[PDB]
Amino acid sequence: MKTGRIVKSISGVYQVDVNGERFNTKPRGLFRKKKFSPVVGDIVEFEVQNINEGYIHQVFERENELKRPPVSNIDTLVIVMSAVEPNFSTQLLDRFLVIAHSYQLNARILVTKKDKTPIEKQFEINELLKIYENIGYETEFIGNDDDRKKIVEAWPAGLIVLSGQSGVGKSTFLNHYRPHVELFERQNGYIADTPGFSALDFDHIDKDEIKDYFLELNRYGETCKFRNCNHIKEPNCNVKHQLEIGNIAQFRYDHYLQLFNEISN
Amino acid sequence: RGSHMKTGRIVKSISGVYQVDVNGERFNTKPRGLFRKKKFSPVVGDIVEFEVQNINEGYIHQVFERENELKRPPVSNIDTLVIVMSAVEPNFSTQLLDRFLVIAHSYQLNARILVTKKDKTPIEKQFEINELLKIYENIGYETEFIGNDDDRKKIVEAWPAGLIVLSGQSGVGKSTFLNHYRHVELFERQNGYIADTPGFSALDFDHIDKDEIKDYFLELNRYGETCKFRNCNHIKEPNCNVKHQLEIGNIAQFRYDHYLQLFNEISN
Ligand SMILES: [Zn+2]
Ligand SMILES: [Zn+2]
């Protein structure tokens, strides 16, 4: 028996990587079901046959997954934002982070097009990224002067998936590895060759979960007077309080309220 | 207005006054003479009978025989020792966990296993760890694997009734469980109490003989019953059921390996 990640799917043959060695595996004889469809990202236990073939015994229960593209067990969603063309937007970035955590994904932030960004504007984005760093995210600000392969190689261990709108430069990263979805090797893991549905979407989300996905509202929410305080019109609200003494950025709370209202309608 | 003689647990010990919890009510008790005359040696966790004096104080009558204890810190009558290990920072070690379980059972403590930092752990490593925890489960331990997402107060509340002591080394996430509650003190929870402790160490080559080690590998204990050899240490003895169960996969190699290393280490 061997364990590894499915990196490639084609006509019901699943290619599992085990310590850099590829095995062309299939489902064992019995399996056809609603719970019988492996995806790229799946961790499987398989029995070796014919040197580099095998028969999948179990698919481990997925920690997470996306439907478009179909990919499971994502270790880090990199949210890719351009500094210009279009302008860096905390409204958009806050939306993306919320959707990331709605799918249970760890996220980090990558800003592109530094070399096309006026330095005064660069310094504005820097102070904004420090508020995201306060909240708990890793942030990077790059342009054409930075080695993209080494950026990708240095990201945390495991499966990287890139997410972000068209034209932010995701393919500039994905073409150091590439030329449906396939995983490619990094020194300490993998990267998917297809972005996470680009401008990512929420799937099902209720108005009461949004505060969970603002990680600082989540934290500061723990002592709000009301049990399930939405931090909107509740008295004795510690989010309102931490906002008032400046440990929550106003744009974060503004975006929270906008999204809360959007989801209710 | 209540009864005269009461039984409960010492939750706090400060300068010769022993605070005793009787059904959620605290009584500050001591021996009924000069503190000098050293009559009782009570420890946090002790079950004691006292006579009620001046409303919410008392005279200790009797400390019941300890079912178990630690000397460091000094705490008796532990219902569950929770061994807290990180998945990462530092890396999960079946070597260290096996050692901790041996110390635990050497003090006749029931143990369970808590792994932290799931959220900092690459998913492929998480599944490796889930696969190792299933082996400890087959051996008969309760196991949990948590990160930041999980509700601590809730987990710490859902553990078996009575006194929980968390044990594990520096920087593993233990402080985080206790902050929903706050030498040593017990804090009330629904269904019992909880306390802290800084992990084990010089407790192996402290009171354990080479011949006891196999008692505290719970599956070696159980399989050892039908070894032909008297006092079988499962090393080179023939007609060894441990060696046999191992050969057919009922004992994990890493368990037998850790047993062998520890045995050789205590032969010094
Ligand atoms: Zn609130
Ligand atoms: Zn034996």
Numbering used by the authors:
A (entry chain A): 1 to 179, 201 to 286
B (entry chain B): -3 to 178, 201 to 286
Publication excerpt:
One class of assembly cofactors are the ribosome-associated GTPases (RA-GTPases), a subset of P-loop GTPases within the TRAnslation FACtor associated (TRAFAC) family, of which the proteins RsgA, RbgA, Era, and HflX are members. RsgA is a nonessential, highly conserved late-stage 30S assembly cofactor that has been implicated in the docking of helix 44 (h44) of the 16S rRNA into the correct conformation and therefore correct maturation of the decoding center prior to subunit joining. The overall structure of RsgA consists of three domains: the N-terminal OB-fold, the central GTPase domain, and a C-terminal ZNF. Both the OB-fold and the ZNF domains are involved in nucleotide recognition and target RsgA to the 30S ribosomal subunit, where they contact major helices of the 16S rRNA.
To look more at the mechanism of (p)ppGpp-mediated inhibition of RA-GTPases associating with ribosomal subunits, we solved the structures of RsgA in both the apo- and ppGpp-bound states by X-ray crystallography in order to compare to already-available GMPPNP- and GDP-bound structures. The 1.94-Å structure of RsgA complexed with ppGpp reveals the presence of the nucleotide unambiguously represented in the electron density map, whereas the apo structure at 2.01 Å lacks any electron density in the nucleotide binding pocket. In our structures there is no electron density corresponding to the Mg2+ and the switch I/G2 loop is unresolved, likely due to innate flexibility when not contacting a γ-phosphate. Compared to our apo - and ppGpp -bound structures, the switch II/G3 region appears highly similar to that of the GDP-bound structure, leading us to conclude that the OFF conformation is maintained whether in the apo state or when bound to either GDP or ppGpp and that the switch I/G2 loop would remain disordered in the absence of GTP. The biochemical studies carried out here indicate that ppGpp-bound RsgA most likely mimics the GDP-bound OFF state, an assertion that we corroborate by solving the crystal structure of RsgA in the apo- and ppGpp-bound states.
